[PDB]
Design a binder for this molecule. Sequence first.
Ligand SMILES: O=C(O)[C@H](Cc1ccccc1)Oc1ccc(-c2ccccc2)cc1
Lengths: 270, 270
Amino acid sequence: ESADLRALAKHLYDSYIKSFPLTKAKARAILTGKTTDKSPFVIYDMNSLMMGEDKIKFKHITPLQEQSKEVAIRIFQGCQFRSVEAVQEITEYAKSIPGFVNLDLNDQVTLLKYGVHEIIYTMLASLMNKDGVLISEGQGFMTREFLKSLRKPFGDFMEPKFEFAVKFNALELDDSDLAIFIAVIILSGDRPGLLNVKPIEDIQDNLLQALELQLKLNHPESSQLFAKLLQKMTDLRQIVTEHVQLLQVIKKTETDMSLHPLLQEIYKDL
Amino acid sequence: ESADLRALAKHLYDSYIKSFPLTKAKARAILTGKTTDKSPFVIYDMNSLMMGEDKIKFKHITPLQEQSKEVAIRIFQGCQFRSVEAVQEITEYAKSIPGFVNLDLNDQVTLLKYGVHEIIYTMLASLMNKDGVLISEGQGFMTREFLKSLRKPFGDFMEPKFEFAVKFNALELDDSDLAIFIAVIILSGDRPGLLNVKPIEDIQDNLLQALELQLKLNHPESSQLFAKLLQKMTDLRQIVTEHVQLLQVIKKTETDMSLHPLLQEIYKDL
Ligand SMILES: O=C(O)[C@H](Cc1ccccc1)Oc1ccc(-c2ccccc2)cc1
């Protein structure tokens, strides 16, 4: 019954909004979109970063570039802190999806563990455009040009995403679309370790139906959109694979240090 | 109109039969040991592989292996024969896809370059069951167990495809289904290098409509099969990749060998 799907879509959309601070609507208005009433603090150079990290609401480190920690490492470490926040926001949204909390606790952990990266890159695209990504609750903007002028290892760290984001955003999806999509991702069924796949695919199936209806009604002239969105899941997978790679590579730069114990402890890998 | 779509499905199914000698239909008939009009010779060890050259058209070596192109090599030399055989075939099927031959000559080469291996592992699935795969046009059956006990590297060339096959075959798709799915794979548009994307996406958007109707009609009691099928394309991409990196391994540990030109031309790391 379409009566239930429309209902399921509104529920999830509602949770998505109350779960994620920066929405794509809120992000798009700030971005390319005009809507100028509080412009962001651009970061196009080493000086932009420095001459700004001391005036931007950031809770980790301040501008100190001169034989005192490097810029390429400070930015990466910075994205890990934030991704720990996102993981928490995603976990909360996961518990709003009908059926998720009723699943075996182990599988819930497995679904989150293996779906968090795909969700993050999907939402990252809401903050990015061909020229950069919004930063800090949408208070800054780190240009795409800067990010590529980063150290030898971090130079390819964000370029692939930018390429994915541009294609993904061409779909012109809104938060009500992304909400259902993000749920489909969480409720996969192919994640390794699942103890009871039936309920998971049962829910994904119901989420997939909602998503389909949501796209037909919300984008009536955008043919086969549903199909395009699902085939984007192939792109995210590579994005996640390719990500664990550069990670292992980075895991061969900074390592043995006695001050990282309880700090590294908080930032395992995901 | 859903009538042109049905006509497209029929058209495609028709060219599919005309380009592929061993359909899933014939393959399943041979695999269901019940149908004994012509059963296969089961390869599951050296003696079997050895005797396999008597009841099959195995032009390879029957006697000693190691000091004369070991068993492993022999098996993959043939494998290589099949891919090129499949490429030429898939290449023939592609020309039947409406509009494909009208695309930019270069894009045609790109659609095939990235499409053909995803298609080969899709169709290869029709020849597998949890236990093994039919070889030499169904005349033979090589055990999954035997294939996995080969030399350190060659040993794990097929396992990831058997795992794909087991879950992909659970979808119970038939030749008329795969025909349209196989066409959706080629007419991607997200393939690297494509000079002209719009025209390509107009064809695929057409192929996806067809496939959607085909699945609803041919598998009415199968919810979200369409979606399930499209997500399977993510598995395909991954399989292609692990494969190439394996090929790169042999390329270094076997300098006396050779990866066929056509396959070499198609393959590019990264
Ligand atoms: O990569 C390819 O194009 C094919 C794809 C394929 C794999 C399994 C069944 C049918 C096709 O798989 C090959 C794997 C190994 C080899 C090979 C050839 C000579 C020596 C060592 C490996 C050739 C093809």
